Amino acid sequence: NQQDFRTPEFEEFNGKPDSLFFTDGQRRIDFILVYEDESKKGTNEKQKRKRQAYESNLICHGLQLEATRSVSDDKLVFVKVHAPWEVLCTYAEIMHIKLPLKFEKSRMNDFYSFFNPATRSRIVYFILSRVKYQVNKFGINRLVSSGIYKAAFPLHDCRFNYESEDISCPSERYLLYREWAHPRSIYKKQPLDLIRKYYGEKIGIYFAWLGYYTQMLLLAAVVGVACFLYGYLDQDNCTWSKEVCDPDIGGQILMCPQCDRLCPFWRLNITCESSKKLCIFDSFGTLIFAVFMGVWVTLFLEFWKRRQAELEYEWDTVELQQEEQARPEYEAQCTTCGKCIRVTLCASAVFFWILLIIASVIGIIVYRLSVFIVFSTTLTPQMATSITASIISFIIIMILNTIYEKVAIMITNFELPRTQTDYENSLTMKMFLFQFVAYYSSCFYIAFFKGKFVGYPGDPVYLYRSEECDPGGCLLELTTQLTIIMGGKAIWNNIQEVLLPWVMNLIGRYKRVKITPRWEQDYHLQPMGKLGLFYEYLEMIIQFGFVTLFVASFPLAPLLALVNNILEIRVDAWKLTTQFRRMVPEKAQDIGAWQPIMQGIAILAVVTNAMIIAFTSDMIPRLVYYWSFSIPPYGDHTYYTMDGYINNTLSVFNITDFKNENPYIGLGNYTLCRYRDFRNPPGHPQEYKHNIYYWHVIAAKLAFIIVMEHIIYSVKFFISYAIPDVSKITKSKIKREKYLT
Amino acid sequence: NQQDFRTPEFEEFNGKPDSLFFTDGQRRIDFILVYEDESKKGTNEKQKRKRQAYESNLICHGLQLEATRSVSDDKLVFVKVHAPWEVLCTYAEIMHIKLPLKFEKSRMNDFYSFFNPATRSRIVYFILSRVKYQVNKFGINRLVSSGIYKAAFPLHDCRFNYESEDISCPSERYLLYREWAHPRSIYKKQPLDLIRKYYGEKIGIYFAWLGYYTQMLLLAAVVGVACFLYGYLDQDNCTWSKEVCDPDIGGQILMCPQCDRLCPFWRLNITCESSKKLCIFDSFGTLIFAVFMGVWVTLFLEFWKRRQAELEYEWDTVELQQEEQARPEYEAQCTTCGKCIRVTLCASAVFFWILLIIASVIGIIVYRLSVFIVFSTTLTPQMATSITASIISFIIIMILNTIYEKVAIMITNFELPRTQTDYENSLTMKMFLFQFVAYYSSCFYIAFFKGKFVGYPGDPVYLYRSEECDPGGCLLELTTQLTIIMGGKAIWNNIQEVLLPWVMNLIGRYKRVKITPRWEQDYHLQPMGKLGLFYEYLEMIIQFGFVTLFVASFPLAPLLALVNNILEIRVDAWKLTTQFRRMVPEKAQDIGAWQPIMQGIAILAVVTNAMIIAFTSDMIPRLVYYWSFSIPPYGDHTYYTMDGYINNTLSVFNITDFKNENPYIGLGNYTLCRYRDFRNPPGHPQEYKHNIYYWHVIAAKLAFIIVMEHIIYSVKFFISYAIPDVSKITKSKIKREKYLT
Ligand SMILES: CCCCCCCCCC(=O)OC[C@H](COP(=O)(O)OCC[N+](C)(C)C)OC(=O)CCCCCCCCC
Ligand SMILES: CCCCCCCCCC(=O)OC[C@H](COP(=O)(O)OCC[N+](C)(C)C)OC(=O)CCCCCCCCC
Ligand SMILES: [Ca+2]
Ligand SMILES: [Ca+2]
Ligand SMILES: [Ca+2]
Ligand SMILES: [Ca+2]
Ligand SMILES: [Ca+2]
Ligand SMILES: [Ca+2]
């Protein structure tokens, strides 16, 4: 318990470049602790005292340590840490590790190189965290946080690209780089058992979840492509789009200006090309695919639960949960009311940043309003404005995202979660809320609040001059925004993931920090961090939200996500294998709070899709016209039809503007202009007021919302009730295990 | 394992009337087995052989048996069964019973009359079920089912009304009859710990759940009475009801006949008294109470979960679940596809009975249509018809309920569930489905399908002549039906529960089957049955459905349920204590599938209340008129108001009937009659067609449904997320137990 003897067999050796064993080679390296001591104000002496005390306690606990001087930096010292068989057995009895038994699985010790390097490293890390050094001080995490130990990490088997020089060593890292984690193997299956063996249950479960997600996205994308091709082949029969394109009918419709000044009365001809591709995106194919996706999200969740149960059986992810140690930062600072006030203050700051991104969205709105005029003066101008606004909003969101990552780390540090699990949960909720708002605010605005509250040309709604939507609807604009944001986020995240660790390693090599041992080689790598796969999970959950929430706009979102996931598996695996220092294996029976987040997103997706179809799409007005306003009571046709829809939907407007300006007279010489609304024509007893057609349409929209929501929720409940969360084969295997044992 | 020696100390004694011990009095009675053997075709010999083998096996296992001849029936033999201390200890080690420890609680045996009579009986019953007698035969349940043993049951402490003759015996039954299970103690608290000690965890958890349910109903009823009194005090300001009552305005409205023949054109005056009491039942008070109940159901569920966790800690309801034995009926008969086909056939039969009760509802509809004419020819006739139909439907439902109980037992016997738990689950789902349909079909019809599809007087909707609703709405009729069904079911169930066991015991005494011992006294009692509190749970769940689903009609449903529960606690406790043979204690950590049923009812209640308020109540039309049709654009009043609502809502009808009969001319000499619909007046370009007012009203109804459902579901989610399911005190106690142990 005191610093008496530390660091035996202190001897420098680098002749063996690829070896995970000690100088004698009898016992392997389970951990590496990196420090430096030769080079003020007594701090060096204090750190030396504390480190010597910790090393003495470690050796007293039974571990074997051997330190070598770095061949490059004379001040760096690497301490290789190995655990004897007796220590491994006793600390595997302390924490109930399941081992192969004659391949049955059971508790602390079984009957049967016996411990894999991953579990050896896990046991050694548990010992390092438990052993005290000193008031009381707990373990190695506090030493690392205090700068006493520069690093502490396990070792990789070998170089990822080259086979290990040692022949008895199975080059698992090389195999995982060759048959995995490499674009050359982009098509092969994932060796989930092997990657679990090499990295741990957390990484294994993440990669299994990603693979299952890709598998389900394959089915969703196939069905979406089927619906999209149905809509594409029915393009020749778009009655309303053909009518818009027709100069005889759509050409004679003079739409009123959108802005007050310097915007001409424009004919509907300029909307022909956009209408052609819009008819594909708002059709019965997209409606059927929205219903199918409502079913498919439930299928995805249920089958992931079944796969998770299967993996819980096969990998034994359920271990006894020992009391989680308090974080060193929390324990350094140690009333309850004050900490509650601090939590409320942190939440206030987070909602302040949410208000900031909302203000950014409002700024984008103002940019659209200001730039439409210059686009018109100088590929219709409205489409160009929409595309440019989408690009600018995407860039602004991406720029804000990194700053929010930094300040979210700052905020979660300012508040004090005692355990790493509490830190992870708080960061999860905070980060997910901000990412949700930032990445979905513009899409939600385009879907639900763009063009909905504008009024008629007389007495328009001012904020100033709220955005008016296109006569065909804003579903095309929403689809463009979704494509831009989703594809750009995917590409940008992949580029950042590939480059940032690689660039950091390259600059580390350039700073000169030839033959070098394994501990040095792995030390010259970027640490993954205390969080781990948090950002990978967050990215995948954001992609899932994009796929599910706005699937009613275009059916190709599952296909885009499928391509993104096929690339994502390989990029994540490659960076984890090559560019990052090895992490201590953990145990995880699920994905964490991300699964409740996905369940909430699944519940919200039904409402979002129903409201998208009802409000942002013109399908309900078209159906209402076809079934009720082409018949004799309100129309002239003998049978149900869609012709005349454009002429009978748009409302007339004689030029009589309220003086509460009248810019139409200054902007043109025309007398009657048509606007996309369902108000009464001029000369009516109640002119410019909502009419029977408007109320019929809105009643149909609300009835569709109610019917779709209730039917889809009922079907989801029935499917969840019908599908058992545990597979029959897994049940049989569990019963066999219980019977044998 | 063979019948060699059975039934030691076979000696008849009845001198001690109140004693739970053997003839020597040293060891107590843990069980009683009743049989008879002296009195064909060799069956008596076969049963004698099997019973002797079972008794020999019982004695070999360590139990002590002593049989006495019945003092009344010479053929009846009672076998008292006692377990020695060693047998109790070994079979308490086999199944991990938690015992007091120095009062901490822990596993099979602790350090400290030691076993309560309840747990002694539970251990002895476990032994009886496990011991084999014989192909292989399992235990005592098969013998009882086969008629070998006439009965097998534990004993009560004493007579419920008289203190036990023995002085060392704590008369727990007498105490539980004096301070509980008695109307004289209708106001006192429930000794939950004492009743759990005497009966078991199942009975204890049921009574605790009932008490908590009553406690929450108290709050719900107080709030409902507040809202009801608000509506009652605002009765003097009901503008529309006062207008209806006014002969100057409501008296001049001539409503068209409802039936085709022999129904007069009737003035709205006859609706004045019903409108007066309807204004109380459809108001903002009832709306606010519906929202409050939406919150209150979530509060109820969350706090019941917290109370359940507290009881799990305090009573140790979580025991190790040994493998449940197969039912004797299932094991007597022992492919999978055939049994699946049988299950589908049984489900088809159940849905057939559901169709039968639906046909009964249709018959009630036909009865109303046929009897309104005779009521009019011979307390307005429509109200009299509604009340009589409610009474008849209630009687028919009650008559069908018992027959369905019998045939549901038959169906669950026809299908083969291997375990009693599977039997309980299947019977639960089947019985709950039928009870739901039977008790809610008429209410759902009145709420959602009565008067909704009738058309206008020209071209009315025929099935024939679907029921037309009152001008004020059918919320009053729904409230009357709810009051009738709920109160009648409560009274009828209480009367049946009180009388049926008591009547059976009385007729058993009358059939002569004076001083008698404890085993005979308890044998002359009605057995509870293998199900137990299944019907009590079902009754309470049906009452909960009545309270929650239709709470938007009248706010006094929680008060009625509160009175019913205050009576129900005492009646259930009294019958369980006095009229029923004692049951073996069980262990239960919750109420079972009834909790998922309650969660489903809670989810459905939001939709049901929103749709009730929107469709069956006139609040939405009144609000729409006030805010949009009393203003100059559609009305003449300068400010928002409600006057003129009756005259401006009802639609006119000139007498021009389609010849697709024309009975109006034969039934009266009038020319213009007003009907409750929002169609255009005669002479309009599109007359007798839905108008802008109708579409505005329906759009408002659907918007209200959407807004209310989404807001209430969001609030329920937030409340469930905010409330932790485990109380802080229970968490502290669990942490203290973990720290000490
Ligand atoms: C819960 C997460 C998602 C929430 C999304 C909320 C979206 C709300 C959208 C909304 O209220 O939009 C306005 C609607 C529909 O009016 P539209 O007929 O689409 O507007 C006409 C536009 N025009 C003048 C160019 C012809 O105007 C109405 O009359 C609709 C009133 C009913 C709203 C129901 C939604 C309430 C949700 C809580
Ligand atoms: C889920 C468990 C509960 C289900 C309850 C379903 C209730 C359906 C009721 C229904 O559709 O009723 C017809 C509605 C109401 O219009 P009303 O104005 O009440 O009908 C005319 C009545 N009058 C001639 C005497 C003036 O007329 C309409 O146009 C309503 C159409 C919108 C129906 C939305 C509900 C769909 C639920 C799945
Ligand atoms: Ca990526
Ligand atoms: Ca990633
Ligand atoms: Ca399921
Ligand atoms: Ca009752
Ligand atoms: Ca009862
Ligand atoms: Ca909760």
mmCIF file with all atom_site columns, N, CA and C and ligand atoms in Angstrom, chain A residues 489-490 493-494 497 536 539-540 564 568 571-572, ligand 3:
data_model
loop_
_atom_site.group_PDB
_atom_site.id
_atom_site.type_symbol
_atom_site.label_atom_id
_atom_site.label_alt_id
_atom_site.label_comp_id
_atom_site.label_asym_id
_atom_site.label_entity_id
_atom_site.label_seq_id
_atom_site.pdbx_PDB_ins_code
_atom_site.Cartn_x
_atom_site.Cartn_y
_atom_site.Cartn_z
_atom_site.occupancy
_atom_site.B_iso_or_equiv
_atom_site.pdbx_formal_charge
_atom_site.auth_seq_id
_atom_site.auth_comp_id
_atom_site.auth_asym_id
_atom_site.auth_atom_id
_atom_site.pdbx_PDB_model_num
ATOM   1  N  N  . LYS A 1 489 ? -25.347 15.202 -45.677 1.00 0.00 ? 489 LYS A N  1
ATOM   2  C  CA . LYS A 1 489 ? -24.938 14.744 -44.357 1.00 0.00 ? 489 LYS A CA 1
ATOM   3  C  C  . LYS A 1 489 ? -24.207 13.416 -44.453 1.00 0.00 ? 489 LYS A C  1
ATOM   4  N  N  . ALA A 1 490 ? -24.713 12.496 -45.278 1.00 0.00 ? 490 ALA A N  1
ATOM   5  C  CA . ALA A 1 490 ? -24.038 11.214 -45.443 1.00 0.00 ? 490 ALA A CA 1
ATOM   6  C  C  . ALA A 1 490 ? -22.624 11.403 -45.981 1.00 0.00 ? 490 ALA A C  1
ATOM   7  N  N  . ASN A 1 493 ? -20.333 13.343 -43.422 1.00 0.00 ? 493 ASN A N  1
ATOM   8  C  CA . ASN A 1 493 ? -19.964 12.515 -42.283 1.00 0.00 ? 493 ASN A CA 1
ATOM   9  C  C  . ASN A 1 493 ? -18.971 11.435 -42.683 1.00 0.00 ? 493 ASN A C  1
ATOM   10 N  N  . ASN A 1 494 ? -19.160 10.817 -43.851 1.00 0.00 ? 494 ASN A N  1
ATOM   11 C  CA . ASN A 1 494 ? -18.208 9.802  -44.289 1.00 0.00 ? 494 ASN A CA 1
ATOM   12 C  C  . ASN A 1 494 ? -16.834 10.407 -44.538 1.00 0.00 ? 494 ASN A C  1
ATOM   13 N  N  . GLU A 1 497 ? -15.258 11.193 -41.137 1.00 0.00 ? 497 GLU A N  1
ATOM   14 C  CA . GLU A 1 497 ? -14.847 9.967  -40.463 1.00 0.00 ? 497 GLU A CA 1
ATOM   15 C  C  . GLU A 1 497 ? -13.581 9.390  -41.083 1.00 0.00 ? 497 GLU A C  1
ATOM   16 N  N  . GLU A 1 536 ? -21.552 7.271  -33.798 1.00 0.00 ? 536 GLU A N  1
ATOM   17 C  CA . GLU A 1 536 ? -22.040 6.349  -34.819 1.00 0.00 ? 536 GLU A CA 1
ATOM   18 C  C  . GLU A 1 536 ? -23.516 6.039  -34.610 1.00 0.00 ? 536 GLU A C  1
ATOM   19 N  N  . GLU A 1 539 ? -25.557 9.168  -35.570 1.00 0.00 ? 539 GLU A N  1
ATOM   20 C  CA . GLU A 1 539 ? -25.679 9.323  -37.015 1.00 0.00 ? 539 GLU A CA 1
ATOM   21 C  C  . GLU A 1 539 ? -26.696 8.347  -37.587 1.00 0.00 ? 539 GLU A C  1
ATOM   22 N  N  . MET A 1 540 ? -26.646 7.087  -37.148 1.00 0.00 ? 540 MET A N  1
ATOM   23 C  CA . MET A 1 540 ? -27.588 6.105  -37.673 1.00 0.00 ? 540 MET A CA 1
ATOM   24 C  C  . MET A 1 540 ? -29.018 6.416  -37.244 1.00 0.00 ? 540 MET A C  1
ATOM   25 N  N  . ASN A 1 564 ? -25.938 4.527  -48.224 1.00 0.00 ? 564 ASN A N  1
ATOM   26 C  CA . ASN A 1 564 ? -25.172 5.138  -47.148 1.00 0.00 ? 564 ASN A CA 1
ATOM   27 C  C  . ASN A 1 564 ? -24.721 4.100  -46.131 1.00 0.00 ? 564 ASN A C  1
ATOM   28 N  N  . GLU A 1 568 ? -21.234 2.882  -44.931 1.00 0.00 ? 568 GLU A N  1
ATOM   29 C  CA . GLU A 1 568 ? -20.982 3.214  -43.533 1.00 0.00 ? 568 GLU A CA 1
ATOM   30 C  C  . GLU A 1 568 ? -20.374 2.042  -42.784 1.00 0.00 ? 568 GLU A C  1
ATOM   31 N  N  . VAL A 1 571 ? -16.669 2.049  -43.789 1.00 0.00 ? 571 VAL A N  1
ATOM   32 C  CA . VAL A 1 571 ? -15.875 3.167  -43.282 1.00 0.00 ? 571 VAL A CA 1
ATOM   33 C  C  . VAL A 1 571 ? -15.694 3.063  -41.771 1.00 0.00 ? 571 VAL A C  1
ATOM   34 N  N  . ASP A 1 572 ? -16.767 2.749  -41.036 1.00 0.00 ? 572 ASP A N  1
ATOM   35 C  CA . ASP A 1 572 ? -16.645 2.614  -39.591 1.00 0.00 ? 572 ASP A CA 1
ATOM   36 C  C  . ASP A 1 572 ? -15.702 1.480  -39.224 1.00 0.00 ? 572 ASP A C  1
HETATM 37 CA CA . CA  C 2 .   ? -20.628 8.124  -41.815 1.00 0.00 ? 3   CA  C CA 1
#
